Amino acid sequence: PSTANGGFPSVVVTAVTATTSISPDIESTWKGLLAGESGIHALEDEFVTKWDLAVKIGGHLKDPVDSHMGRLDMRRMSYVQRMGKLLGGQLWESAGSPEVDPDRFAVVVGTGLGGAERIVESYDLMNAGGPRKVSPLAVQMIMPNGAAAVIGLQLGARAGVMTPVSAQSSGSEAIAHAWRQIVMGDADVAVCGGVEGPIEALPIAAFSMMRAMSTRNDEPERASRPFDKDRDGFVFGEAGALMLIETEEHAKARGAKPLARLLGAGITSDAFHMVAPAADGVRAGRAMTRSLELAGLSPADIDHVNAHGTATPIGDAAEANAIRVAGCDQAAVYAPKSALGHSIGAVGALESVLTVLTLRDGVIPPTLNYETPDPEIDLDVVAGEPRYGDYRYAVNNSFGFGGHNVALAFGRY
Amino acid sequence: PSTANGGFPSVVVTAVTATTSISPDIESTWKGLLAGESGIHALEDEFVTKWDLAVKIGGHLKDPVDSHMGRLDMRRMSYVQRMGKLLGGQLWESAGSPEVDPDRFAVVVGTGLGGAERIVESYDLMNAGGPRKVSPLAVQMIMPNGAAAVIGLQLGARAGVMTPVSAQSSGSEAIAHAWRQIVMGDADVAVCGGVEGPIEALPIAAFSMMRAMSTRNDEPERASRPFDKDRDGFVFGEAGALMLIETEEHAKARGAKPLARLLGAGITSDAFHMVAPAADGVRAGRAMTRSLELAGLSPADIDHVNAHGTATPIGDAAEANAIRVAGCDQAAVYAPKSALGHSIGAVGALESVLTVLTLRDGVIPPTLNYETPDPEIDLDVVAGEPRYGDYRYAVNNSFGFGGHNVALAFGRY
Ligand SMILES: CCCCCCCCCCCCCCCC(=O)O[C@H](COC(=O)CCCCCCCC[C@H](C)CCCCCCCC)COP(=O)(O)O
Ligand SMILES: CCCCCCCCCCCCCCCC(=O)O[C@H](COC(=O)CCCCCCCC[C@H](C)CCCCCCCC)COP(=O)(O)O
Ligand SMILES: C=C/C(C)=C/[C@@]1(C)SC(=O)C(C(C)=O)=C1O
Ligand SMILES: C=C/C(C)=C/[C@@]1(C)SC(=O)C(C(C)=O)=C1O
Ligand SMILES: [K+]
Ligand SMILES: [K+]
């Protein structure tokens, strides 16, 4: 049973939404990426000078989420819930505000952590004033399923609301489980993707003490260099992204025009190390291969891989080996974190949206900063200008601390 | 496609482990439940008198996790990671330390929040001493997939390590997803269940300010009264629990004796309110119905329901309606939170283990404190003494804030 042999129903992507450091409008982000734009800038936040942080660069959203939030939203939701509400409404409107059967409608939204600012706020309030200063809303704002639950309540989803957490693969893992929910017959339509918090001092300190972050502060747009010989770690770039997926039958019955097909998904784990990927890429390549088995594709069918490509020395080398293991190392490769940075729990969902746009429009944007090939890598990294083609099938990769490997196989509609 | 019709492979439970407020030994917890024991006591923690907390009752683990941990693990793992390492090693030993194929072995472990004490710790450290005082291990201890990832690394699981977060249904949801992973062909064997943090002052304040908790401080063992007319909210009782599931042919091949069969799982959502269950019980009933459809059972086959039964007024009334919607209201009902209290992200896993032991041993423990029947409930609540019977099929219910409904259908082996 595969998508190609009709063992699974055909599942299509019928709407996308994202907010990024380039634009709040996904179509404008996409045009910016194709024009070689970067969302990364010097950080001007007072927290950078307060703490004299070693990292002084990153991409805040172009259009801050809270400029769209009312007084009560700011007091009743954590930041990732507010992002989830903003994007869920935008996605539904982009889909034509369909009146779907709530009992066949699921939501699957990943995030790295949850409403953690409300944990530190509640802690401070109780230390200063005692237990009765904690909000009656604290639990529901903090719980990591909070953003998915807000979207499910907002949009009326009664076929399940799920939150897989797998660190930096959470946003792709969510789209994998939404596809599973549909092909298993538990839903006909799902909103899925990932949301994440903004850049702040404590997140920068924690990842900096792992020695995982770029410190190329003098040239912020040049700092994120996935697959490049001179890379020196990742750069934060804020985002959130959701997509609407549904059976092809369901889309046809309501007149939705698909953007792409979501053909299959593979999830594996390394059992190697908690915070470094296995150098051999074997289990990561097996997640890619499993997505092909469930799609009914061979590796030679894959015209494009949207790489997780964080720009760490270790991570990019492992992913290049994984792509080789899966037989996909003659695909054209894009590493979007070169322009958009790393949004942790959201980023797999953002990069799945970009993989969809590559299939819809026949173009891969250039990987920024790809100037000096690294002989360990040996991939067809698209650089300098966009790569045009009749792309038929593509894989999006995402990986996370914990050893999680997620691959999603998409096709042109 | 159902378990009964052979459309899904047969999946069996081959080992269980749990630590509770009654015992660290699940067989002793089980004997204690049957004897009418309660794990709930007056809280003697200094934090109760420090804050003059309204809630002064709960069940700490009989044997603290950290009596088994050294200072190095106590500094380099969060508490839920330490609980997961302790339980995962105990489970694997109980299973006979099998040499399974890593590439066919998955882990699915839910939790409500994650390594949140390390969030407030890192915040305090940075406020006192700057960003370079944050631990280089802080991210991997905080991330909510951390416990599942520790277990996956410890035991060698390469077929996926998943953490579904759905608040108080997370422990059951994890078992649901592990069953899906096996029946979809991505694993032959899985460790699954849930872990959760201990009772502490800030968790008590947050839930207390929801007005959800019992304050029957005078008579701690009498406080948790699921389905009783005089119930007044839930009581914390610490736990963590894991089970080993595997295909029946994998169990046979290694000579493992099954404890029970895991036949099907249903997940739905309410889209009603963030922290109140839908009064009609309709979507929660449909999670039970879905687990029967995938099992290949009818409601008339069900002998036993292990209720989520938190002892809130509105919660138990909605669940009674859900059990009626599913046609399961002739079954014998147990509410284990009456004795063990509520362990949040672990509790659905704990109660799945108890459902397995009910089928294995042909006995349901008494629901403690069930003294005055409530006309809105109208269920056969087992009480007073344990009830012996030839139980063949049981459903375990769990629900969570966000409107999450999970039902698991188990059978006697
Ligand atoms: C692309 C970035 C991704 C970062 C990913 C981090 C993961 C979670 C990020 C959650 C942060 C949400 C912050 C939103 C609210 C906000 O902004 O509040 C500022 C004031 O600062 C704060 O309250 C800071 C509160 C910090 C909360 C605790 C963060 C703990 C971080 C860990 C120690 C390290 C990261 C763990 C990641 C684990 C999961 C992924 C592997 C404006 O305040 P005001 O002036 O308007 O009053
Ligand atoms: C059955 C209870 C379930 C409760 C579940 C609630 C969530 C669990 C969160 C994990 C808590 C782990 C605590 C382990 C370490 C420990 O205990 O450290 C104490 C000292 O206290 C602390 O550091 C407390 C640290 C507080 C951490 C933040 C807690 C935030 C809680 C939220 C405001 C409210 C709950 C949100 C739940 C959302 C998910 C479920 C809906 C001994 O110190 P020492 O003797 O070693 O010196
Ligand atoms: C098991 C550890 C893995 C997969 C680590 C990666 C490559 S994932 C990721 O997103 C990332 C960074 C630093 O962003 C990694 O270092
Ligand atoms: C949508 C909200 C739900 C399901 C609420 C429940 C009944 S679940 C649970 O575990 C619980 C408590 C207080 O423990 C609830 O109040
Ligand atoms: K990618
Ligand atoms: K239960």
mmCIF file of C-alpha atoms in Angstrom, chain A residues 8 50-53 81 102-103 105 112-113 116 119-120 122-124 126-136 138-140 142-146 149-150 152-153 156-167 173 177 179-181 183-186 201-202 205-207 209-211 265-275 283 290 294 401-402 404, chain B residues 8 50-53 81 102-103 105 112-113 116 119-120 122-124 126-136 138-140 142-146 149-150 152-153 156-167 173 177 179-181 183-186 201-202 205-207 209-211 265-275 283 290 294 401-402 404:
data_model
loop_
_atom_site.group_PDB
_atom_site.id
_atom_site.type_symbol
_atom_site.label_atom_id
_atom_site.label_comp_id
_atom_site.label_asym_id
_atom_site.label_seq_id
_atom_site.Cartn_x
_atom_site.Cartn_y
_atom_site.Cartn_z
ATOM 1 C CA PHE A 8 -3.798 5.274 0.518
ATOM 2 C CA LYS A 50 21.903 44.273 28.638
ATOM 3 C CA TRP A 51 23.590 40.858 28.613
ATOM 4 C CA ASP A 52 26.314 41.590 26.018
ATOM 5 C CA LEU A 53 25.295 38.426 24.176
ATOM 6 C CA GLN A 81 -1.189 30.539 21.058
ATOM 7 C CA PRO A 102 -16.173 19.232 12.107
ATOM 8 C CA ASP A 103 -16.230 15.494 12.901
ATOM 9 C CA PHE A 105 -11.600 17.846 10.623
ATOM 10 C CA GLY A 112 9.373 23.277 20.476
ATOM 11 C CA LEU A 113 8.304 24.185 24.019
ATOM 12 C CA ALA A 116 7.117 29.117 28.503
ATOM 13 C CA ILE A 119 5.933 29.712 33.332
ATOM 14 C CA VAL A 120 8.490 32.342 34.238
ATOM 15 C CA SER A 122 3.760 32.695 37.028
ATOM 16 C CA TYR A 123 6.933 31.779 38.958
ATOM 17 C CA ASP A 124 7.764 35.487 39.459
ATOM 18 C CA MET A 126 3.948 33.638 43.068
ATOM 19 C CA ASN A 127 7.448 34.371 44.467
ATOM 20 C CA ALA A 128 6.457 38.027 44.866
ATOM 21 C CA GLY A 129 2.841 37.677 46.033
ATOM 22 C CA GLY A 130 1.904 34.076 46.760
ATOM 23 C CA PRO A 131 -0.175 31.397 45.061
ATOM 24 C CA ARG A 132 -3.296 33.548 44.578
ATOM 25 C CA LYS A 133 -1.339 35.765 42.173
ATOM 26 C CA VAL A 134 -1.110 32.928 39.620
ATOM 27 C CA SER A 135 -3.632 33.331 36.780
ATOM 28 C CA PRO A 136 -6.489 30.832 36.525
ATOM 29 C CA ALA A 138 -1.810 29.794 33.486
ATOM 30 C CA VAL A 139 -2.190 26.061 32.913
ATOM 31 C CA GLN A 140 -4.002 26.414 29.591
ATOM 32 C CA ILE A 142 1.559 27.017 29.356
ATOM 33 C CA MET A 143 0.607 23.481 28.231
ATOM 34 C CA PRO A 144 2.472 22.710 25.016
ATOM 35 C CA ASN A 145 -0.717 21.519 23.268
ATOM 36 C CA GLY A 146 -2.102 25.029 23.861
ATOM 37 C CA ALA A 149 -5.948 23.514 20.984
ATOM 38 C CA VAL A 150 -6.609 27.214 20.295
ATOM 39 C CA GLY A 152 -8.897 23.464 17.042
ATOM 40 C CA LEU A 153 -11.341 25.511 19.110
ATOM 41 C CA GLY A 156 -14.053 23.819 15.103
ATOM 42 C CA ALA A 157 -11.982 20.659 14.632
ATOM 43 C CA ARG A 158 -13.553 17.596 16.289
ATOM 44 C CA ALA A 159 -11.584 14.765 14.662
ATOM 45 C CA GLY A 160 -8.524 15.210 16.927
ATOM 46 C CA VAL A 161 -6.119 17.972 17.966
ATOM 47 C CA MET A 162 -2.574 16.733 18.320
ATOM 48 C CA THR A 163 0.771 18.236 19.218
ATOM 49 C CA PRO A 164 3.877 16.136 18.455
ATOM 50 C CA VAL A 165 6.991 17.564 19.983
ATOM 51 C CA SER A 166 10.356 16.645 18.498
ATOM 52 C CA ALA A 167 12.362 19.817 18.915
ATOM 53 C CA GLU A 173 6.322 15.834 12.250
ATOM 54 C CA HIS A 177 0.874 12.808 11.609
ATOM 55 C CA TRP A 179 -1.285 12.823 6.704
ATOM 56 C CA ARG A 180 -1.416 9.609 8.784
ATOM 57 C CA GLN A 181 -4.714 10.711 10.378
ATOM 58 C CA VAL A 183 -4.914 8.062 5.272
ATOM 59 C CA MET A 184 -5.990 5.982 8.381
ATOM 60 C CA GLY A 185 -9.541 7.299 7.906
ATOM 61 C CA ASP A 186 -9.810 9.427 11.025
ATOM 62 C CA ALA A 201 17.883 36.410 25.568
ATOM 63 C CA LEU A 202 17.427 33.149 27.466
ATOM 64 C CA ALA A 205 22.078 31.953 25.944
ATOM 65 C CA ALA A 206 20.997 28.310 26.085
ATOM 66 C CA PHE A 207 21.818 27.496 22.472
ATOM 67 C CA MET A 209 26.287 27.535 25.566
ATOM 68 C CA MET A 210 25.955 24.508 23.250
ATOM 69 C CA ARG A 211 28.373 26.252 20.852
ATOM 70 C CA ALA A 265 5.952 10.601 5.378
ATOM 71 C CA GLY A 266 8.742 8.773 7.176
ATOM 72 C CA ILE A 267 9.745 9.096 10.813
ATOM 73 C CA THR A 268 12.764 7.386 12.362
ATOM 74 C CA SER A 269 15.220 7.957 15.198
ATOM 75 C CA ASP A 270 18.981 7.744 15.527
ATOM 76 C CA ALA A 271 19.596 6.279 19.013
ATOM 77 C CA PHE A 272 23.057 7.875 18.741
ATOM 78 C CA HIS A 273 23.281 11.125 20.701
ATOM 79 C CA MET A 274 20.879 13.584 22.237
ATOM 80 C CA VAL A 275 22.145 16.737 20.504
ATOM 81 C CA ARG A 283 18.519 6.386 10.092
ATOM 82 C CA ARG A 290 10.249 5.391 4.168
ATOM 83 C CA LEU A 294 4.691 5.124 1.305
ATOM 84 C CA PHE A 401 17.510 17.132 19.129
ATOM 85 C CA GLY A 402 16.569 13.757 20.619
ATOM 86 C CA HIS A 404 14.365 12.590 15.471
ATOM 87 C CA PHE B 8 -4.378 -5.009 11.403
ATOM 88 C CA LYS B 50 5.353 28.453 53.393
ATOM 89 C CA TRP B 51 2.565 29.504 51.020
ATOM 90 C CA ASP B 52 -0.391 28.415 53.205
ATOM 91 C CA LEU B 53 -1.705 26.503 50.209
ATOM 92 C CA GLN B 81 14.056 12.377 32.158
ATOM 93 C CA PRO B 102 16.672 -1.382 16.784
ATOM 94 C CA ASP B 103 15.346 -0.459 13.364
ATOM 95 C CA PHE B 105 11.788 -0.544 17.801
ATOM 96 C CA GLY B 112 2.230 17.255 30.293
ATOM 97 C CA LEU B 113 5.056 19.805 30.186
ATOM 98 C CA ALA B 116 10.185 22.879 33.311
ATOM 99 C CA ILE B 119 13.413 26.661 32.708
ATOM 100 C CA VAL B 120 12.982 28.532 36.002
ATOM 101 C CA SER B 122 18.107 28.740 33.885
ATOM 102 C CA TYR B 123 16.117 31.975 34.248
ATOM 103 C CA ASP B 124 17.353 32.446 37.823
ATOM 104 C CA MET B 126 21.019 34.077 34.078
ATOM 105 C CA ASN B 127 19.364 36.799 36.118
ATOM 106 C CA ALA B 128 21.989 36.314 38.814
ATOM 107 C CA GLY B 129 25.119 35.772 36.721
ATOM 108 C CA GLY B 130 24.482 36.432 33.025
ATOM 109 C CA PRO B 131 23.999 34.293 29.934
ATOM 110 C CA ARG B 132 27.126 32.157 30.346
ATOM 111 C CA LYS B 133 25.797 30.742 33.604
ATOM 112 C CA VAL B 134 23.063 28.834 31.735
ATOM 113 C CA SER B 135 23.873 25.120 31.495
ATOM 114 C CA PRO B 136 25.153 23.737 28.210
ATOM 115 C CA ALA B 138 19.693 23.155 29.493
ATOM 116 C CA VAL B 139 18.023 22.796 26.084
ATOM 117 C CA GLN B 140 18.128 19.023 26.085
ATOM 118 C CA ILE B 142 13.975 21.312 28.994
ATOM 119 C CA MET B 143 12.638 20.125 25.643
ATOM 120 C CA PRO B 144 9.395 18.190 26.202
ATOM 121 C CA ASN B 145 10.562 15.298 24.024
ATOM 122 C CA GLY B 146 13.500 14.894 26.419
ATOM 123 C CA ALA B 149 14.486 10.723 23.832
ATOM 124 C CA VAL B 150 16.369 9.520 26.936
ATOM 125 C CA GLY B 152 15.070 5.893 23.079
ATOM 126 C CA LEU B 153 18.799 6.437 23.485
ATOM 127 C CA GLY B 156 18.309 1.761 21.381
ATOM 128 C CA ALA B 157 15.094 2.630 19.540
ATOM 129 C CA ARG B 158 15.686 3.548 15.863
ATOM 130 C CA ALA B 159 12.120 3.312 14.471
ATOM 131 C CA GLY B 160 10.989 6.651 15.885
ATOM 132 C CA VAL B 161 10.801 8.452 19.237
ATOM 133 C CA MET B 162 7.561 10.364 19.632
ATOM 134 C CA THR B 163 6.130 12.632 22.354
ATOM 135 C CA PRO B 164 2.439 13.489 21.921
ATOM 136 C CA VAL B 165 1.311 16.222 24.271
ATOM 137 C CA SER B 166 -2.368 16.437 25.148
ATOM 138 C CA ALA B 167 -2.322 17.435 28.826
ATOM 139 C CA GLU B 173 -2.308 9.113 23.571
ATOM 140 C CA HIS B 177 0.289 6.308 18.648
ATOM 141 C CA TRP B 179 -0.221 1.023 18.401
ATOM 142 C CA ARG B 180 -0.636 3.057 15.152
ATOM 143 C CA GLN B 181 3.133 2.852 14.480
ATOM 144 C CA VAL B 183 -0.157 -1.447 12.730
ATOM 145 C CA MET B 184 1.084 0.926 9.932
ATOM 146 C CA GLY B 185 4.261 -1.168 9.650
ATOM 147 C CA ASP B 186 6.839 1.246 10.976
ATOM 148 C CA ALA B 201 3.907 24.557 45.108
ATOM 149 C CA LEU B 202 3.585 26.278 41.689
ATOM 150 C CA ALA B 205 -1.246 27.106 42.845
ATOM 151 C CA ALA B 206 -1.953 26.968 39.092
ATOM 152 C CA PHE B 207 -4.477 24.151 39.237
ATOM 153 C CA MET B 209 -6.665 28.846 40.913
ATOM 154 C CA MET B 210 -8.778 26.970 38.311
ATOM 155 C CA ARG B 211 -11.017 25.877 41.218
ATOM 156 C CA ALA B 265 -7.385 3.312 19.737
ATOM 157 C CA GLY B 266 -9.609 6.292 19.072
ATOM 158 C CA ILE B 267 -8.652 9.992 19.288
ATOM 159 C CA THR B 268 -11.133 12.827 18.825
ATOM 160 C CA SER B 269 -11.525 16.397 20.077
ATOM 161 C CA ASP B 270 -14.403 18.444 21.476
ATOM 162 C CA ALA B 271 -14.039 21.956 19.994
ATOM 163 C CA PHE B 272 -16.062 23.129 23.012
ATOM 164 C CA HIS B 273 -13.918 24.765 25.679
ATOM 165 C CA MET B 274 -10.252 24.823 26.623
ATOM 166 C CA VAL B 275 -10.705 23.567 30.183
ATOM 167 C CA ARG B 283 -16.994 13.507 20.783
ATOM 168 C CA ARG B 290 -13.566 4.577 17.129
ATOM 169 C CA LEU B 294 -10.627 -0.418 14.858
ATOM 170 C CA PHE B 401 -7.434 20.229 28.669
ATOM 171 C CA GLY B 402 -7.661 21.450 25.052
ATOM 172 C CA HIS B 404 -8.642 15.915 23.780
#
